[PDB]
From a paper:
The Staphylococcus aureus PII-like signal transduction protein PstA was recently identified as a cyclic diadenylate monophosphate (c-di-AMP)-binding protein. Here, we present the crystal structures of the apo- and c-di-AMP-bound PstA protein, which is trimeric in solution as well as in the crystals. The structures combined with detailed bioinformatics analysis revealed that the protein belongs to a new family of proteins with a similar core fold but with distinct features to classical PII proteins, which usually function in nitrogen metabolism pathways in bacteria. The His-PstASA protein has a calculated mass of 13.9 kDa; however, SEC-MALs analysis revealed that the protein forms a 43.9 ± 0.84-kDa complex in solution suggesting that PstASA is trimeric in solution, similar to classical PII proteins.
The protein crystallized as a trimer in the asymmetric unit, and the crystal structure of the protein·ligand complex was solved at 2.0Å resolution by molecular replacement using the apo structure as a model. The c-di-AMP bound at the monomer-monomer interface with three molecules bound per trimer. The main differences between the unbound and bound structures was in the T′-loop, which was disordered in the apo structure but became structured in the c-di-AMP·PstASA complex, thereby providing many stabilizing interactions with the ligand, particularly through Phe-36 (see detailed description below). In addition, the large B′-loop (amino acids 68–92), which was unresolved in the apo structure, was more ordered in the complex, forming two anti-parallel β-strands. The c-di-AMP-binding site is overall positively charged due to residues Asn-24, Asn-41, and Gln-108, with the latter two residues being in hydrogen bonding distance with the ligand. The adenine ring Aα is held in place by a face-to-face π stacking interaction with Phe-36 (monomer B) and a π-cation interaction with Arg-26 (monomer A), whereas the adenine ring Aβ forms a face-to-edge stacking interaction with Phe-99, and three hydrogen bonds with the amide and carbonyl group of Gly-47 (monomer A) and the side chain of Thr-28 (monomer A). Asn-41 forms a hydrogen bond with the ribose ring, and additional hydrogen bonds are formed between surrounding waters, which are conserved across three monomers, and the oxygen and nitrogen groups of the ribose and adenine rings, respectively.
Residue numbers in the entry:
A (entry chain B): -7 to 74, 88 to 109
B (entry chain A): -8 to 72, 88 to 109
C (entry chain C): -8 to 73, 91 to 109
Amino acid sequence: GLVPRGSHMKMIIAIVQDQDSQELADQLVKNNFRATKLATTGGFLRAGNTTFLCGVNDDRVDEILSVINQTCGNREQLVSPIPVEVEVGGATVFVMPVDAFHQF
Amino acid sequence: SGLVPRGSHMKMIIAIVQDQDSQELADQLVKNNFRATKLATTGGFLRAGNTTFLCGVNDDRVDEILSVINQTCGNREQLVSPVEVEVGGATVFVMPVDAFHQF
Amino acid sequence: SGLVPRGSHMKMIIAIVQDQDSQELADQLVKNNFRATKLATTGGFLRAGNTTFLCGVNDDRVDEILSVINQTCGNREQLVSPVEVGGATVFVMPVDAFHQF
Ligand SMILES: Nc1ncnc2c1ncn2[C@@H]1O[C@@H]2COP(=O)(O)O[C@H]3[C@@H](O)[C@H](n4cnc5c(N)ncnc54)O[C@@H]3COP(=O)(O)O[C@H]2[C@H]1O
Ligand SMILES: Nc1ncnc2c1ncn2[C@@H]1O[C@@H]2COP(=O)(O)O[C@H]3[C@@H](O)[C@H](n4cnc5c(N)ncnc54)O[C@@H]3COP(=O)(O)O[C@H]2[C@H]1O
Ligand SMILES: Nc1ncnc2c1ncn2[C@@H]1O[C@@H]2COP(=O)(O)O[C@H]3[C@@H](O)[C@H](n4cnc5c(N)ncnc54)O[C@@H]3COP(=O)(O)O[C@H]2[C@H]1O
């Protein structure tokens, strides 16, 4: 496997809005984070979103989380019902353990 | 930071279900305040469409989410054509989560 | 209530492979009785299609599944431009429980 002795990888599963996905992807690339992206849909709104799977060494988790925050952070937008302020953007991130990482 | 209180644990549920049951599962998850993200997937053996749900849940609600999945997507008998067939079925993985964040 | 015998452990294999190798990997998984669910994905760098396989496997068959992936997708590098793109990237992840309903 590719993990040095005593170190650990994590799997980041980040669910972000489609409007922020290209900017996140560009920033992950710029910071040399590898990603795989999935076109997904939310259970509540049933609208398209984007899920990123990023395998990262534990020592770069805080950095990836800051990239995701800077690009996909929650913010307000005025909309008209049927002008009110609503939350848009935002990221939901799971950090999961990885036992091994291989490249063939 | 992270959304998990000290000493508690989250789990990630990966549920692979049939396409015909996916809308009822999604409705029931919503009704019970479970969040989900869904993926259109295909099976390795039959190469036919199915649906994969990713649900991050607190450990204390795992049994509850499993029961919702079972009730809505469990394997069962159905008359068609009148012939009896097996329909539905869910495969579920419960996986550990180190941290959970919202930004 | 799960499918995992007492004292044993399941793992989730997440294998990201190129679309050109996907069908042959799928056939070999099937032939060796490995279950897989496939996801149509795209790479973060090249933004081009690839395939992600999720395979829940008992720990005692992890080395075998890795050797299937290697035999089918390994030594399969190609240079491309939007860059070495490998045969397979595989994560082995822990699973607490496994259920069929
Ligand atoms: N039962 C409920 N009651 C009241 N409000 C509800 C609700 N379910 C969802 N919402 C609201 O709807 C937003 C979009 O949820 P959706 O399921 O379409 O789209 C979600 C979903 O695809 C994913 N997600 C969030 N938490 C998740 C989890 N625990 N597991 C899996 N996916 C999750 O992230 C997207 C953004 O979620 P976020 O939490 O930022 O934003 C949520 C939340 O503000
Ligand atoms: N350990 C695991 N890891 C990842 N994904 C998993 C999994 N177990 C199940 N799945 C997913 O769940 C679907 C339903 O599988 P199930 O075992 O209910 O129902 C299966 C099973 O009854 C049968 N089957 C699958 N592979 C087989 C094999 N090698 N030999 C005999 N029967 C097989 O065909 C059905 C459809 O399989 P298919 O592959 O098309 O579709 C699968 C697959 O997408
Ligand atoms: N740690 C990880 N987490 C999640 N997914 C992962 C991953 N490592 C690899 N992948 C997935 O596997 C595909 C093939 O990766 P590989 O590293 O062989 O081949 C890579 C690598 O040789 C190169 N590459 C990727 N990012 C790079 C960067 N920032 N700088 C230079 N080369 C890069 O581009 C190839 C294609 O990358 P692409 O992103 O389109 O597609 C990737 C991505 O979808």
